[PDB]
Each structure stands twice: as structure tokens, then as C-alpha cells.
Amino acid sequence: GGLVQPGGSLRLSCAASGFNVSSSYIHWVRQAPGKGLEWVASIYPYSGYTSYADSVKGRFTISADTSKNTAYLQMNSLRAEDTAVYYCARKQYNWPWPYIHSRYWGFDYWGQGTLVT
Amino acid sequence: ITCRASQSVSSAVAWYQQKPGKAPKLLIYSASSLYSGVPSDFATYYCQQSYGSLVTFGQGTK
Amino acid sequence: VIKVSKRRWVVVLVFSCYSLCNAFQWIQYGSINNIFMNFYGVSAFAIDWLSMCYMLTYIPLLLPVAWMLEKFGLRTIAITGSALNCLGAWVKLGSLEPHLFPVTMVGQVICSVAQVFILGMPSRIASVWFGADEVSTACSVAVFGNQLGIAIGFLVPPVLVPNIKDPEKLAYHISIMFYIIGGVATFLFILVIIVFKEKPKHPPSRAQSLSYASYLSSIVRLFKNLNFVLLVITYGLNAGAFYALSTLLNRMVILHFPGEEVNAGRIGLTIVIAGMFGAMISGIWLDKSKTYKETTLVVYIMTLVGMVVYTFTLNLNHLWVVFITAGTLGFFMTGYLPLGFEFAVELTYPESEGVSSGLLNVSAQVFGIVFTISQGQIIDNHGTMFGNIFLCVFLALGSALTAFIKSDLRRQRANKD
Numbered sequence: 001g002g003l004v005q006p007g008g009s010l011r012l013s014c015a016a017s018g019f020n021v022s023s024s025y026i027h028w029v030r031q032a033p034g035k036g037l038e039w040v041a042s043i044y045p046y047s048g049y050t051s052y053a054d055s056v057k058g059r060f061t062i063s064a065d066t067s068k069n070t071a072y073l074q075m076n077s078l079r080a081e082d083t084a085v086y087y088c089a090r091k092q093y094n095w096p097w098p099y100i101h102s103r104y105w106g107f108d109y110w111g112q113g114t115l116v117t
Numbered sequence: 118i119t120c121r122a123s124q125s126v127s128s129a130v131a132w133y134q135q136k137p138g139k140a141p142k143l144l145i146y147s148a149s150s151l152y153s154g155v156p157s158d159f160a161t162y163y164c165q166q167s168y169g170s171l172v173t174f175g176q177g178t179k
Numbered sequence: 180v181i182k183v184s185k186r187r188w189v190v191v192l193v194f195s196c197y198s199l200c201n202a203f204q205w206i207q208y209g210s211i212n213n214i215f216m217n218f219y220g221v222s223a224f225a226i227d228w229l230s231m232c233y234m235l236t237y238i239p240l241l242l243p244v245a246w247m248l249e250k251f252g253l254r255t256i257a258i259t260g261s262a263l264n265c266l267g268a269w270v271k272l273g274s275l276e277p278h279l280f281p282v283t284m285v286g287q288v289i290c291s292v293a294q295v296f297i298l299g300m301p302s303r304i305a306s307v308w309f310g311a312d313e314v315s316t317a318c319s320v321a322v323f324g325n326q327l328g329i330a331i332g333f334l335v336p337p338v339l340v341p342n343i344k345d346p347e348k349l350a351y352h353i354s355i356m357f358y359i360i361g362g363v364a365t366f367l368f369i370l371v372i373i374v375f376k377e378k379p380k381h382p383p384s385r386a387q388s389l390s391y392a393s394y395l396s397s398i399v400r401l402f403k404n405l406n407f408v409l410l411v412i413t414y415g416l417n418a419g420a421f422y423a424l425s426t427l428l429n430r431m432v433i434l435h436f437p438g439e440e441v442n443a444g445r446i447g448l449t450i451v452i453a454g455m456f457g458a459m460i461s462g463i464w465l466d467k468s469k470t471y472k473e474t475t476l477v478v479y480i481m482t483l484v485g486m487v488v489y490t491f492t493l494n495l496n497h498l499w500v501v502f503i504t505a506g507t508l509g510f511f512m513t514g515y516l517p518l519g520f521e522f523a524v525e526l527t528y529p530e531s532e533g534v535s536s537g538l539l540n541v542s543a544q545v546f547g548i549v550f551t552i553s554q555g556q557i558i559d560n561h562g563t564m565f566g567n568i569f570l571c572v573f574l575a576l577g578s579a580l581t582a583f584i585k586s587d588l589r590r591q592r593a594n595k596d
């Protein structure tokens with residue numbers, strides 16, 4: 001976290017411990033003052049699969065070095081819309097147990113947030 | 118509270134309790150599974166789907 | 180009392196069905212090769228080994244299963260093959276997470292073991308249950324089951340599993356395929372336990388009534404034959420070229436026509452189903468013409484031509500030429516298989532069919548491994564054109580040797596005196 005000038009490039013770096021980051025999915029959720037929680041991107045850091053919200057589109061890019069247990073969200077083009085506390089969340093892989101269990105994990109290990117203005 | 122979905126999410130909805138100035142807390146996963154760490158005060162409660170390549174929270178409820 | 184039952188057609192239709200189910204598993208992964216490589220994050224070599232484990236297991240375990248088919252009898256082998264099919268199909272369920280490619284491989288090695296018990300049965304099922312005017316129909320049904328399993332394992336996986344990237348929506352689509360084939364395998368295993376009988380109450384055939392009232396030694400007199408060694412090597416080159424082309428078909432078709440995974444499975448089906456007409460036509464023409472070396476030579480050279488056509492038109496960006504050329508190549512590659520087996524029976528008449536067939540199989544499997552590994556390295560480095568010219572140069576070599584196999588027909592020399 002920290003302060004950036006519009007049109008800049010910030011690299012948020014989330015670090016985990018106690019669970020290996022390649023086992024799970026890692027999500028980034030921003031929450032601006034008075035707009036509630038808003039999902040940004042996710043990554044399965046073993047398959048490198050990443051997903052992004054149509055809101056960011058091109059600017060943001062999520063990645064992870066699954067050898068130090070850290071994920072990174074780098075920004076490229078910023079607005080006044082992109083200012084908010086950025087939380088790091090984990091979903092654990094939802095195993096395909098059709099009907100018999102069918103358990104849809106929800107982030108259970110949220111991040112303590114980091115402010116970016 | 119009532120959370121409805123524009124598509125089929127198929128019980129991949131979770132509920133989160135966010136009290137002011139803090140990271141949220143998971144309450145119910147799978148739409149019907151109480152999370153052990155935070156089992157059931159007053160705060161903002163957000164529902165959230167996980168069915169789809171993009172994860173979508175709710176409007177927000179105080 | 181000599182009489183044929185009606186269980187003779189149940190026993191075979193059940194065998195043919197679990198025989199079909201194992202063959203789908205042989206290719207269930209090779210058919211979506213780029214999708215499993217993405218799921219498990221492994222190479223193409225690693226997903227190729229899910230096809231090559233069937234070839235590798237068959238080689239050491241061919242003699243032990245022959246010894247157990249003679250010592251324990253037909254029903255134990257049936258129960259064993261169908262149970263190992265069920266067990267592999269049901270172990271594959273515990274590998275549905277990107278990190279669990281060792282578990283998919285363990286389940287596939289179990290299914291490969293099941294293969295060795297399934298492939299030794301057809302001729303003995305025919306012998307034990309069917310009259311002497313029905314044994315060839317029975318063996319044809321029993322081998323048609325396996326090959327229809329290969330054609331269904333090429334067409335169904337891509338249809339059931341899309342080329343998507345999310346590791347947990349893709350495991351949903353893989354788990355549905357694993358569940359179907361674990362449910363089908365379990366149904367056929369339960370069927371076998373109830374349906375399979377060791378023997379019919381009466382002998383079906385006069386030869387079977389007679390038989391009721393050593394392999395290693397055969398193997399060492401078969402390598403005293405230069406013509407049979409030529410035929411072993413050339414049949415191996417041809418059937419191993421087919422194993423290589425099947426394992427590696429998704430790779431090359433997807434390198435050229437990206438996004439066409441459904442049509443890659445359809446082209447595999449085209450290969451196999453055209454080849455079933457090849458085997459049917461060849462077998463008929465051979466049985467009615469008795470020209471063993473000349474038919475073998477013509478269908479081998481035509482295998483060469485069809486690979487040269489397939490090689491040098493795969494880059495024309497027309498996916499319909501790939502259908503023509505693969506359905507032709509399969510026609511002749513699978514049409515050559517009955518010829519090879521028959522000409523080996525003839526070139527070695529006093530010897531046991533089942534040893535000549537076991538040796539022809541062992542060579543096909545050794546060359547299938549050699550080619551699949553080799554070609555995949557060539558393709559990964561030099562492209563599909565050079566990976567395919569690699570398989571044209573061995574079909575040309577095999578064609579050159581098929582010309583040097585002397586037409587020594589010892590079965591026609593004996594059976595009409």
C-alpha cells in the first residue's frame with residue numbers, strides 16, 4: 001500500500017503463511033469508501049489461471065511466485081475509481097463431488113487489507 | 118436476508134460480515150454450511166457467488 | 180452330446196463390452212491431450228505415458244497371464260480383468276485436482292494391467308463356447324469391441340470436457356467422464372460375475388470335445404524362422420506407427436487447427452471406423468483369395484502412401500483433407516492387421532497361433548512406445564511435418580522388408596494334401 005499519482009503503476013504484494021499458495025486460489029477484493037466489497041482478480045497459482053473483473057479490463061494483472069508463498073496484483077492505469085482498501089482472500093479448490101457433497105468454498109482466510117489512495 | 122442471482126449459481130453463495138474498518142468475515146459457505154471459525158452483532162453483510170469465472174459480491178446490507 | 184448354448188452370445192457380448200470399456204480408457208486421456216496437460220500442468224510426454232502404459236504393461240505380463248488363463252480358467256480371468264478395469268476406473272476419481280497426476284497414472288496402470296487379461300481371452304472364449312463354424316464370428320465381435328472402444332474414447336472425451344482453463348470447472352467436466360466410465364465398468368464387472376460361466380454344459384465343438392479328452396519352447400523355434408522374424412519386425416513397425424499416430428493425434432491436429440478438439444476426436448473416430456472396414460474387406464479378400472504375401476505387400480505400401488498423403492496435406496489448413504487422409508490411412512493401417520496375423524499363422528503352421536500373435540503384439544507395443552516417444556520429441560522440436568516424415572521412413576522401411584518375406588505357406592501346404 002501507499003500513495004500513487006493518477007496514471008501510475010502500483011504493485012500490491014500479498015504474502016501467506018501456514019498454507020501453500022499453490023494449493024488454493026488467491027483473490028483480490030477492493031472496497032472503496034461507501035461502495036462495499038468489489039472483486040478484482042483471482043489466480044490458481046499452480047495452473048497460473050487468472051480471472052479479472054470487466055471493471056479493470058486491461059490495467060490490472062494478477063500473478064504469484066508459488067515458491068515464496070506470495071501473490072501480486074500490479075496496477076498500470078489508475079483512477080479515482082481505483083482508490084480503496086485492497087484485501088487478499090483465499091478460496092480452496094472446490095473438489096468435484098457432484099450432488100453428494102458439492103461444497104462451494106468461500107474465502108475463509110481474508111487479508112487484513114492495505115490502503116491505496 | 119434475500120440474495121437472488123441473475124443466473125444459476127447453484128448454491129455457490131457465501132455470506133460475509135463486514136463491521137466498519139476491518140477485513141470481512143466468512144459466515145456461511147456453500148449457501149448452507151456454517152463456517153467453523155465464525156459461527157453464529159451488527160455490521161455490513163455481503164453475499165457472494167463463486168459460480169462463474171468472475172466472482173460477484175452483493176450490493177451490501179447494513 | 181455336442182451342442183451350442185445361448186450364453187455363448189451373452190458371454191461374448193459382455194466380454195466385448197468391458198473389452199470396449201478398457202480401450203476407451205486407453206485413449207480417454209490421449210484424445211484430450213492438451214486439456215489434461217493444462218489441468219495437471221504436465222508436459223505432453225506425461226499425458227502420452229497414459230497411453231504408453233498400456234503398451235508397456237502388455238510386454239512383461241503377456242506370459243504370466245497366459246499361464247493363469249491355463250491354470251485358473253476363463254471365468255477367473257474374466258472376473259480379474261473386469262475387476263481391474265473397475266478398480267482403475269474408480270481410482271481415477273481421486274485424481275480430480277491439478278496436483279494429482281500420480282493418481283491418474285496409478286489408475287491408468289491398473290487399467291493397463293486389466294488390458295493384458297482382456298486381450299488374451301477372445302480366441303479362447305470363441306473356442307470354449309462356440310461351434311467351429313462360429314469361432315471367427317466370435318473373435319470378430321470380441322476384437323470389434325475393443326476397436327469400437329478406441330473410436331468412442333476418441334470422440335467422447337472432447338465432447339464431455341471443454342478446453343476451459345479454470346482448474347475447478349474443468350475438474351467438473353473431467354469428473355463426469357470418470358463417473359460414467361467407472362459406472363459402466365462397475366456395471367460390466369457385476370455383469371461378468373453373474374453371466375460368465377467357466378464352460379458350457381456340453382462342448383460346442385467336436386475339436387473342443389476332443390481337446391478336453393509349453394510356450395517358451397515355441398518362442399525359441401519361432402526365432403529360428405527368418406521369415407517370421409521379418410514379419411514380426413514389419414508388423415511391429417506398422418502397428419506401432421498406428422499406436423504413435425493415435426497417441427499423438429490431438430497434438431498435431433491441435434497444433435494445426437487450434438480450437439478443434441471435438442473435430443480432433445472425430446478424426447480419430449474416422450481413423451478407427453475406416454480401419455474397421457479395412458480389416459473387414461482385407462479379411463474377406465484374404466480368406467477368399469489366399470494370396471498372403473501379395474495382399475500383405477500391397478496393403479503395407481498403401482500404408483506408406485497414406486501417411487505420405489497425410490503428412491504433406493496436414494498443413495493445407497483444410498480440415499476436411501485431414502478427414503480424407505486420416506480415414507484412408509486408418510483404412511490401410513487397420514486393414515493390415517488381419518493380414519499380418521494370418522501370414523504369421525501360415526508362415527509357422529505347426530506352431531501355436533497364440534504364440535505368433537503374442538509375438539506380433541509384443542513387437543507392435545515395443546514400436547508403439549519407441550515411435551510415440553521419438554515422434555513426440557521430433558514434433559516438440561521440429562514440427563509435425565518432420566514428426567510425420569519420421570513415421571513415413573519407417574513405413575517405407577517396413578514396406579521394403581515386407582517384399583523380402585518369402586511366401587512359405589505351411590498351413591495351405593498341410594491342410595490340402
Ligand SMILES: C[N+](C)(C)CCO
Nearest residue numbers: 202205233234325329
Ligand atoms: C490395444 N490398445 C490399442 C487399446 C492398447 C494399445 O496399447
